[PDB]
């Protein structure tokens, strides 16, 4: 499972909490993109509309800390295994599309920390490896993932 920490739930409590105001814990839209710059962050006028439209459905609609933190949790997003993989294999591929040799290849599986000694690189070069000498990160990169 995947969802907010005591840490980021801990801080959206104390915004949420000044702005509420009343004696359960829910905010109105109004409030809200308030909420949001006080908390670090700077969503443009169409990002406000976008979100008040979700929530608002007949014009009003109280925010619960339930909805809040769902909605913070998808614009405070922060983690990315399989785009961490093809971002490291892209600085390493100095021309653009994903072309490395084996021994590049070998340093950055062992930089992003793979639990995967040579035996395994060596099965998986065999079915990737097809005799040339520059490897695609685009097939490594999804047998390391996907």
């Given at each position: 499972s995947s969802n907010l920490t005591?840490?980021?739930?801990?801080?959206?409590?104390?915004?949420?909490?000044?702005?509420?105001?009343?004696?359960?814990?829910?905010?109105?839209?109004?409030?809200?993109?308030?909420?949001?710059?006080?908390?670090?962050?700077?969503?443009?006028?169409?990002?406000?509309?976008?979100?008040?439209?979700?929530?608002?459905?007949?014009?009003?609609?109280?925010?619960?800390?339930?909805?809040?933190?769902?909605?913070?949790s998808?614009?405070?997003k922060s983690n990315d295994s399989?785009?961490?993989?093809?971002?490291?294999?892209?600085?390493?591929?100095?021309?653009?599309?994903?072309?490395?040799?084996?021994?590049?290849?070998?340093?950055?599986?062992?930089?992003?920390?793979?639990?995967?000694?040579?035996?395994?690189?060596?099965?998986?070069?065999?079915?990737?490896?097809?005799?040339?000498?520059?490897?695609?990160?685009?097939?490594?990169?999804?047998?390391?993932?996907?």
């Open positions: 005591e840490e980021q739930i801990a801080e959206f409590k104390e915004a949420f909490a000044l702005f509420d105001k009343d004696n359960n814990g829910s905010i109105s839209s109004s409030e809200l993109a308030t909420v949001m710059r006080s908390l670090g962050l700077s969503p443009s006028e169409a990002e406000v509309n976008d979100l008040m439209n979700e929530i608002d459905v007949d014009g009003n609609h109280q925010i619960e800390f339930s909805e809040f933190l769902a909605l913070m998808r614009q405070l399989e785009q961490e993989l093809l971002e490291a294999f892209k600085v390493f591929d100095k021309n653009g599309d994903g072309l490395i040799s084996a021994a590049e290849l070998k340093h950055v599986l062992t930089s992003i920390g793979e639990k995967l000694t040579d035996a395994e690189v060596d099965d998986m070069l065999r079915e990737v490896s097809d005799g040339s000498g520059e490897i695609n990160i685009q097939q490594f990169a999804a047998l390391l993932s996907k």
